[PDB]
Structure 1
Amino acid sequence: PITKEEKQKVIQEFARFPGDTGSTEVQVALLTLRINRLSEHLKVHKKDHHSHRGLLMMVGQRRRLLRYLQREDPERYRALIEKLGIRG
């Protein structure tokens, strides 16, 4: 489940600069990761509509933030796109 450690490690791989204790980068890393192992679970289950739901809202959130990502700058952004994989 939620492995804090490795977590921070990637918050790291991403946060271009070691001083990103909360940045678009991370909103990204995080919502992503979560979204994914979470969802995978969703699959082998089929009925937890409540949490499915939340997950929903969440994914929204993340994507939208990215929205802004583009808004100001999608450049570095597309790089992100890249690094990650999502939206292809």
Structure 2
Amino acid sequence: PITKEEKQKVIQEFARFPGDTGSTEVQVALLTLRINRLSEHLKVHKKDHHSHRGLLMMVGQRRRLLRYLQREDPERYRALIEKLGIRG
């Protein structure tokens, strides 16, 4: 699945200050985690459509948060996309 250790790792990684579980960065991170997991799961099991819908939703969330981040602080945005390697 995704173990709590993995999660806490990425959170501790992308936090803005210690204690931050909620910032845009953290969220986009956790999303990228789950999205990548699901893309891997759907490389096999290509016939599983409902999960696919899930991932469409996740992606849409992400692009939205990222679009907010760019609207807000372009520097943090650039930093993020470069860090996770997004935008495709």
TM-score using structure 2 length:
0.91
Instruction: Give, in whole Å, the separation in 2 of the partners of 1:74 and 1:22.
Output: 19
Deviation at 1:23, TM superposition (A): 1.2
Alignment of 1:6-25 (within 5 A): 6-25=6-25
- 1:52 CA displacement: 0.2
Structure 2 distance, partners of 1:4, 1:50, is 25
Fraction of identical pairs, as percent? 100
* Cα-to-partner distance string for 1:21-70 (whole Å, 9 max, x where unaligned): 21101111110011001111111111111110111011111111110100
Superposed displacement of residue 5, structure 1: 0.9
Q: TM-score, normalised by structure 1?
A: 0.91
SS at match of 2:52: helix
| Superposition CA RMSD, Å | 1.1
Q: Is the Cα contact below 8 Å between 2:16 and 2:23 reproduced in 1?
A: no
Unaligned runs of 5+ in 2: none
How far 1:16 sits from its partner (Å)? 2.7
